[PDB]
Every structure is written in C-alpha cells, then in structure tokens.
Design a protein around this ligand. Structure first.
Ligand SMILES: Nc1ncnc2c1ncn2[C@@H]1O[C@H](COP(=O)(O)O)[C@@H](O)[C@H]1O
Ligand SMILES: NC(=O)c1ccc[n+]([C@@H]2O[C@H](COP(=O)(O)O)[C@@H](O)[C@H]2O)c1
Length: 321
C-alpha cells in the first residue's frame, strides 16, 4: 500500500498527462501549450523516481512516448439495453400504432417527432460529467468499445457543462447517431481515392468505417458528427419528458437536433411526416424517416418494451425513392 496522497497525486497527474497526450497526438489539437505540457510530464517523472512502484508499463511516462492509443473493439456492457425501433411504412400502420397507444394510455400521450438519421448508433456514458465510455449497438446488451474514436468527434464533449437549471448527473447514458454531412462524405471519398483507396458507397458506411478505426487518429481527421436522441441509464436526472431531457442535454453541451417537434395527437404527427417527406432533402445529412415517440416518461414506463423494441415509439420510414 502506497501513501494516499501519493496515490492521489499520481492519478490526477497521470490522468491529466494522458489526456493531453491524446489531444496532441491523436486529435492534433492541444488545449495547453507545449511548455506547460512539458512541465507536467517532468513532475510525473519525478514522482515516479521518488515512488518507483507507480511507474508501470501503462503509465503515461514510462512506456508511453506518442503511443498506447488504440481501439480494440472489445465488448462492453451498456447500462441499459439499447434496442431497435419498430417501423411503419404506411399511413395505416402508423394509425394502427396510434390506436394501440390511445387505447392503452388515452389522450394523455403527446408525441415527440424527430428526424431519423441514417447513420451509426453510438452510446455514450458520462460519469460525474466526464465521458467514460462510448460504444456501438452490438447485440443490444453488449457493444464495442470505440471510446477513443468518440473522443475525437468534435460534437462530443469530454466533459459536460455545468449549470443552474440542470445539474450534471452522476451517471448519464446517452444514445445518438454518428454521421457525415453529404459534402464531407464526398470530400472524404476524394481524399481516399487520392491515396489509392477505395471509396465508400454511402455515408452510412463511410461513417461506420471512420468510427471503427484501430488507430483513432484516423478517425480524428474525418468529420464525423453526432446528434443525440435518447437516454439510457441515468442517475440524478429525472426528466418528466423527453423534450425536457433535450433541454438539459443541450445545456450540458451535448448535441441535439433542431428539427424536433412536439405534436399533440396523431394529426399533428401526420403533418410532420408529410412535411419531412417533402423537405427531408434539404437537410445536410441523410434522413430516412421520422421517429415518433410518446413524450412523457411515465407513459413510456407504462407501455414498456419488448425484447427488441419499445412500444412507445415507432419510426415512420419513407420510401427511399
Ligand atoms: N431520432 C432517432 N431516435 C431513435 N433512434 C434513432 C433515431 N435516429 C436513428 N435512430 C436509429 O435508428 C435505428 C433503427 O431504426 P430503423 O431505421 O427502424 O432501423 C434506431 O434503433 C436508432 O439506432
Ligand atoms: N501541448 C501538448 O499538449 C503536448 C502534448 C504532448 C506532447 N507535446 C509535444 O510533443 C513533443 C514530444 O516530442 P517527440 O515526439 O518529437 O519526441 C514535445 O515537444 C511536447 O511538448 C505537446
């Protein structure tokens, strides 16, 4: 057993050094100067001569020069199951989904209506305002660790912004989609072809590939974006509705969309569906549908979910053309 203050100091310093190493080497974007970094590494090196057991092969000092950052896609459990969505392709089906809902919950349900993004699903975990894990869908219970790749996404903050209205939760699991803008997708393809590589067939594939990189510096230099859509497990945050959840997410610095609307009944839902059927092409990223979700979280709890999907939401899918 090492003395506690020595251990405290070392974790903090090593944590800080490593973050800076990652910012400079992987992301190519430091947030402190070179001078300051140098000082930091020296201290941590001293402390490790003063206390040799602290120096291990995983330390940022001994054995990490510009390296140690790699993604291995190992399994990691999601705190809450990350399911898929049921789909509706015709007006009858949607009405049918709403009939089933009205009958169960009775005019008390309002519907958040969002754009369905055609990209890769990503799940982030923030513990005390700090991002700890990012993962793929996988089987629903377990996905893959692409933590470093997510840390390079500009949209995803490392730490959550504190505030008066919305206190940072102890644990927050957030789902959202990663994607490329069409222009960026084209641009990346040109770049790839310029180095002799094969281009990607669509933005969905391109973003998935850009995210799933063993060397995350590859990912850092690609312009992935993310828009958050969902909550998984949370502690210290109990929003009454999903629309109110997005206010908090936004206050904390997470990225949310500007095209979400709150309809009051199925008629309102139908208007949005019709509207995005006509305007979806004006958005800069791929939209294949609209997600319809009962907004109040108590109603969501009552309706629950099946093994594969929730019953409180349905995604209307457009014909592709
Ligand atoms: N706004 C959104 N809300 C929820 N899930 C979404 C949204 N946009 C995309 N998705 C993803 O779309 C996946 C499947 O939808 P689908 O297109 O029906 O297969 C969902 O499970 C989510 O991962
Ligand atoms: N500002 C930073 O965050 C930061 C982080 C890591 C390394 N660096 C710079 O990296 C260089 C390391 O040297 P070599 O990789 O060329 O040995 C140093 O000059 C160091 O200051 C800067």
């Amino acid at each position: 057993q090492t003395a506690p203050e020595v251990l405290r100091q070392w974790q903090a310093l090593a944590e800080e050094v490593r973050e800076h190493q990652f910012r400079y080497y992987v992301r190519d974007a430091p947030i402190i100067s070179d001078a300051e970094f140098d000082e930091l590494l020296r201290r941590l090196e001293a402390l490790e001569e003063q206390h040799p057991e602290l120096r291990t092969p995983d330390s940022p000092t001994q054995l990490v020069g510009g390296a140690g950052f790699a993604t291995d896609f190992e399994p990691v459990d999601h705190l809450e199951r990350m399911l898929s969505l049921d789909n509706a392709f015709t007006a009858d089906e949607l009405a049918a989904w709403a009939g089933r809902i009205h009958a169960e919950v009775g005019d008390a349900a309002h519907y958040l209506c969002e754009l369905k993004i055609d990209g890769v699903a990503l799940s982030l975990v923030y513990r005390e305002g700090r991002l700890t894990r990012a993962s793929t869908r996988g089987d629903g219970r377990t996905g893959e660790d692409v933590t470093l790749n997510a840390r390079t996404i500009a949209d995803v903050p490392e730490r959550l912004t504190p505030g008066d209205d919305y206190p940072v939760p102890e644990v927050l699991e957030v789902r959202g989609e990663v994607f490329f803008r069409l222009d960026d997708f084209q641009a990346l393809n040109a770049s790839l072809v310029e180095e002799g590589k094969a281009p990607f067939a669509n933005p969905r594939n391109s973003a998935a590939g850009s995210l799933r990189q063993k060397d995350p510096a590859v990912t850092a230099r690609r312009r992935l974006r993310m828009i958050c859509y969902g909550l998984g497990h949370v502690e210290g945050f109990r929003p009454a509705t999903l629309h109110q959840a997005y206010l908090a997410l936004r206050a904390w610095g997470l990225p949310v969309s500007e095209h979400t609307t709150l309809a009051t009944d199925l008629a309102g839902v139908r208007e949005r569906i019709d509207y995005w059927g006509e305007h979806r092409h004006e958005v800069d990223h791929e939209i294949d549908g609209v997600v319809v979700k009962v907004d109040e979280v108590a109603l969501q709890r009552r309706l629950g979910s099946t093994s594969r999907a929730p019953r409180w939401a349905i995604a209307y899918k457009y014909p592709p053309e």
